[PDB]
């Protein structure tokens, strides 16, 4: 998923 | 006398690690039925993985 | 009072049972990664046909690549090899009935069925194949057709010179001469006693094929679709191996939908009412069967 | 102290630790078993059609109008090869480059094998003498270019959840380079209902969340190669490592079709290997956390 | 076979  | 305390933490360490196992072998057994002869038939228990987890909830707290 | 602490041996084991239990896993791994073994192997050697293959070195029959003169692009096809040096090419097979062979005329042209190594699945390579293969320089081509009935008999046909005309003359079957054979000439014709011009209008020799979309027969009507197939259509049929696998080899004029036999037959061998359990067509350079 | 009460949190603890070590020796036996079936290899017979042409289009205008395997040649120059053909679904003519529906092939390989192709094409049908019935397969990042570059092609992705939903994410256009641009990705021209995951990203995540799961313009990663568009120094923290295998990564996903296959369709963190969303995920559709039943990936000229 |  999305890594921030 | 202690070291109890840290016996609940390495069951926690071990709980977490047995159901990461559980569906890392289930995965890679489901895998050899395009490579290999038959695949063995097995079924997933989460709920007991899960349910001795709660478990242990009411230890902690 | 140490209860505990023995619950750390435990432990302690099953730490230890997990640590290797991954590497059985990672071991199984490896052996997960091939595919299923597949059976059908396309073989190396590669020619003009399966006799020019058959002459660079090739033993077993099986599956091939090749490539005529004329030819845009390279296609497979089973090759027959005998061990004596004889390279057949097949383009027409029949056993079961497992394909339909009902079918259009760009489907008749480009091929239908499959391809086995082993030599047991129906097919028809098709018309466009067929001529390219046939039409090669110099030296003509031997058409072979084997037949075989419910009962166990096989028969031969025989015919020289044999080609299939381009596209624009609609795939013309063209020949020489009757070589010779036990199953007789049902390319010239058969009297079947309904009327004396039967022996004229059931005649394969230089008509073109016909399909159920594609008309091109000596007949009013269609023949290629009241028979349901694709073949080189007269007025009707002789020999018609391309038509309808009845179970069984005998079948009447109530079992077909419009009254007029459709079957696998071979009227110079069997009666008009019998349909033929196996049927193979095969072509080789004419020079083969010399010395 | 007069009442020291409680062991009963260590027969508890001896309860669950007791139960672990029949579950470990239930997985010795499992694995121990696996071990002995995969001495003997599975068999095929998919006999080749004898219709071909270039791709699973030429083969339905020249009359393979049956959904199995066949034999395409694309150019004279390339070797021709396996490919599981889509005859019914929307008109037809569709080049299966990828195939999901159980589990029996895994996704995570190395750059090699994505690159020539692993997988089984097409399986048996009993009774029958052909492949009618597709495998899991990837068909190689060499021959998907190629696939894509002979013309306009475009691309269908459908999807299929644990309950019988059925999705599609359809594209205009599409096109895949060669190895030495690491297999970058193009696609345009959105059409379905699954949900723009490779143009747009995740429904569920604004400004640069969203940004960042973008796969139109990025390279082809696998475990043993870097490509992704995640900046770091640790080996551990990359794209195609705690997720599936290998996919056009960004930070990281929106869509991971070459993911690990897991049963039923809800997972979660602490069942995964590393802990991130890995799996058969399209986030547009169901989220992060479910793992799809039915996922294929389909291409066909665009005229 | 033939036709009438
Ligand atoms: C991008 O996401 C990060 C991380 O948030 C996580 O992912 C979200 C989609 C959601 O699932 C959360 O529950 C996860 O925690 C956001 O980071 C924020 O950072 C601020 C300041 O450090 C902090 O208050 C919170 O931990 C985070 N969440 C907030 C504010 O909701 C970040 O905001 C997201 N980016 C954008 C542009 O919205
Ligand atoms: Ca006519
Ligand atoms: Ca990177």
């Not at chain 3, 090759?79 to 383009?91: A, L, M, Q, R």
């Not at chain 4, 053909?85 to 589990?103: A, H, Y």
């Not at chain 4, 997972?267 to 799996?279: E, I, L, P, Q, V």
Request: aromatic share 12%; charged share 25%; glycine share 10%.
């Amino acid at each position: 998923g999305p890594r921030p | 006398v202690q070291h109890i305390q840290l016996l609940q933490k390495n069951v926690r360490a071990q709980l977490v690690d047995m159901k990461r196992l559980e569906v890392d072998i289930d995965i890679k057994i489901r895998s050899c039925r395009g490579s290999c002869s038959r695949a063995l038939a097995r079924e997933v228990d989460l709920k007991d993985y899960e349910d001795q987890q709660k478990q242990l909830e009411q230890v902690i707290a | 009072d140490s209860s505990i602490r023995y619950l750390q041996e435990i432990y302690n084991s099953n730490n230890q049972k997990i640590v290797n239990l991954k590497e059985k896993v990672a071991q199984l791994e490896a052996q997960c990664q091939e595919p299923c073994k597949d059976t059908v192997q396309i073989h190396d050697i590669t020619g003009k046909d399966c006799q020019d293959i058959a002459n660079k070195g090739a033993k077993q029959s099986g599956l091939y690549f090749i490539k005529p003169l004329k030819a845009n692009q390279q296609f497979l096809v089973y090759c027959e090899i005998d061990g004596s040096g004889n390279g057949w090419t097949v383009f027409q097979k029949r056993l079961d009935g497992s394909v339909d062979f009902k079918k259009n005329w760009i489907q008749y042209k480009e091929g239908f069925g499959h391809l086995s190594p082993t030599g047991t699945t129906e097919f028809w390579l098709g018309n466009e194949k067929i001529h390219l293969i046939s039409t090669q320089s110099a030296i003509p081509y031997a058409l072979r057709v084997e037949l075989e009935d419910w009962n166990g008999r096989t028969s031969t046909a025989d015919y020289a010179m044999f080609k299939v005309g381009p596209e624009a003359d609609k795939y013309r079957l063209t020949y020489a001469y009757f070589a010779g054979g036990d199953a007789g000439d049902a390319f010239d014709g058969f009297d079947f006693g309904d009327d004396p011009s039967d022996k004229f209008f059931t005649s394969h020799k230089g008509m073109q094929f016909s399909t159920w979309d594609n008309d091109n027969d000596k007949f009013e009507g269609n023949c290629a679709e009241q028979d349901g197939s694709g073949w080189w259509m007269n007025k009707c049929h002789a020999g018609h191996l391309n038509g309808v696998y009845y179970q069984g080899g005998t079948y009447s004029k109530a079992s077909t939908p419009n009254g007029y036999d459709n079957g696998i037959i071979w009227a110079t061998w069997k009666t008009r009412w019998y349909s033929m359990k196996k049927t193979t067509m095969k072509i080789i350079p004419f020079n083969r069967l010399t010395i | 102290t007069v009442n020291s009460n409680i062991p009963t949190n260590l027969r508890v603890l001896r309860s669950i630790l007791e139960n672990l070590r029949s579950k470990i020796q239930k997985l010795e036996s499992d694995v121990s078993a696996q071990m002995e079936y995969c001495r003997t290899p599975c068999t095929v017979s998919c006999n080749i059609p004898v219709v071909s042409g270039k791709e699973c289009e030429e083969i339905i205008r020249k009359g393979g109008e049956t959904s199995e395997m066949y034999l395409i040649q694309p150019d004279s120059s390339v070797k021709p090869y396996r490919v599981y053909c889509d005859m019914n679904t929307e008109n037809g003519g569709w080049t299966v480059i990828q195939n999901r529906q159980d589990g029996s092939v895994d996704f995570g390989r190395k750059w090699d094998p994505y690159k020539q192709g692993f997988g089984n094409v097409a399986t048996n049908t009993d009774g029958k003498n052909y492949c009618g019935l597709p495998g899991e397969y990837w068909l190689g990042n060499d021959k998907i270019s190629q696939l894509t570059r002979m013309g306009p092609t475009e691309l269908l992705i459908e999807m299929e959840d644990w309950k019988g939903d059925k999705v599609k994410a359809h594209y205009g256009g599409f096109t895949v380079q060669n190895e030495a641009n690491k297999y970058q990705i193009s696609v345009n021209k959105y059409r379905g209902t699954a949900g723009n995951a490779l143009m747009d990203g995740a429904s569920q995540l604004m400004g640069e969340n969203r940004t960042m799961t973008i796969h139109n313009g990025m390279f082809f990663s696998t475990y043993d190669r870097d490509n992704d568009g995640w900046l770091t120094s640790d080996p551990r923290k990359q794209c195609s490592k705690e997720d599936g295998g290998g996919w056009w990564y960004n930070r990281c996903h929106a869509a991971n079709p070459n993911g690990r296959y897991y049963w039923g369709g809800q997972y979660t963190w602490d069942m995964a290997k590393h802990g991130t969303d890995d799996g058969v995920v399209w986030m547009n559709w169901k989220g992060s956390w479910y793992s799809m039943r039915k996922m294929s990936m389909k291409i066909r000229p665009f005229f």
